[PDB]
């Protein structure tokens, strides 16, 4: 009682049920080092202006 599949039936996703646990760490990844400590705060103006030699402002 076998029925041959149609033109576009064997070429689709299947959603197979399994009991094997999902591998939580594929590629055997390392620690992924933490990023730089981003600075937060209010943007105050530059102290005493540009501080470029004799320019006061």
């Amino acid at each position: 009682g076998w029925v041959r599949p149609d033109l576009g039936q064997l070429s689709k996703v299947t959603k197979v049920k399994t009991d094997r646990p999902l591998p939580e760490n594929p590629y055997h990844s390392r620690a992924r080092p933490e990023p730089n400590p981003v600075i937060e705060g209010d943007l105050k103006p530059a102290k005493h202006g540009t501080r470029f030699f004799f320019w006061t402002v």
Binding site: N36, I39, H48, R51
Partner: protein, 63 residues
């Protein structure tokens, strides 16, 4: 006006210049430390982007 005005103005000018000198030395040290080990906002040299890595399943399983 009198000697006290010039005296206090000189004190204020000296305080401004001393703080500016301290900040310039601090800026030099901060820049040197950041470029020696880039961990602050400055001297952040680029890196290939994550958002153009294809994470879809491939034709070959061993990827």
């Amino acid at each position: 006006d009198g000697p006290e005005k010039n005296y206090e103005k000189t004190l204020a000018i000296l305080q401004i210049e001393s703080e500016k000198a301290e900040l310039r030395l601090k800026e030099q040290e901060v820049r040197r430390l950041m470029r020696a080990r880039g961990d602050g906002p400055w001297y952040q040299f680029p890196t290939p982007e994550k958002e153009f890595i294809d994470h879809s399943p491939k034709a070959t399983p061993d990827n």
